[PDB]
């Protein structure tokens, strides 16, 4: 609705910076509303959704388990692990590693996810075999967070990103078992309450997943709708603020406020 990009704009004079706005309709395609469309932002750890997808695309094909069990050590720990930190001993699943990535963000899982699919270069061949040739994924957590003003490393569009949400939730790409377990992560995430959630009705659907990174990057990526079923994909993303993290969570809860309210 109109009033949604009134707060979109009012988000990116109190933030001091480019905020990128997409609301897709996820039955049809439609672009419903848009802010800075085309424009490159970092994704942050709205790849691990992705990264989960080119998992599971793999376990359908026969080429991956979900109960492989992965083994890794002190070594491979690296800022933010809060989940892998624990299982040094015994190691973690698939299963468990893309849970805690997507859930929890845990970083080092994301890496060890990206190992097993072959590093940076294949999820951006996978996304490019999908029809995204937009997004790429350059580096490994946690360097590819830096969001280094006008580099395209580690970047997505709003459009991009959201078409590509679109194809991996309801596209033949993936098995309904895998579009559902993925969907089913992004339900659980457990570290994006102040942002989309706390805007959110009772009743309604979320599944999303949330991003910080350098120079004030944060973002979400959500696919949310009334009744209990989603309907619409919404991303968000900002780089470029000074402002602290509880105002960038602060604009975007006021931005999926408008939303919500402008149904």
Known sequence: HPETLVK??????????????????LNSGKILE?????????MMSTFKVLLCGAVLSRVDAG???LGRRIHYSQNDLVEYSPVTEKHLTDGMTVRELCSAAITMSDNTAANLLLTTIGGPKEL????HNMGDHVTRLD?????????????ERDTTMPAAMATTLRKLLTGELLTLASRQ???????????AGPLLRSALPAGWFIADKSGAGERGSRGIIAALGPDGKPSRIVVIYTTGSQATMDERNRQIAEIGASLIKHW
């Open 124 to 127: 951006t061949a996978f996304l």
């Open 139 to 151: 580096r490994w957590e946690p360097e590819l967070n830096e969001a280094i003003p006008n580099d």
């Open 181 to 191: 377990q993925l969907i089913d992560w992004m339900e659980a995430d457990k570290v």
């Open 34 to 42: 848009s802010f800075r469309p085309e424009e490159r932002f970092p």
């Open 8 to 25: 979109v704009k009012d988000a990116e004079d109190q933030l001091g910076a480019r905020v990128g706005y997409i609301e897709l309709d």
């Open 63 to 65: 080429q991956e388990q």
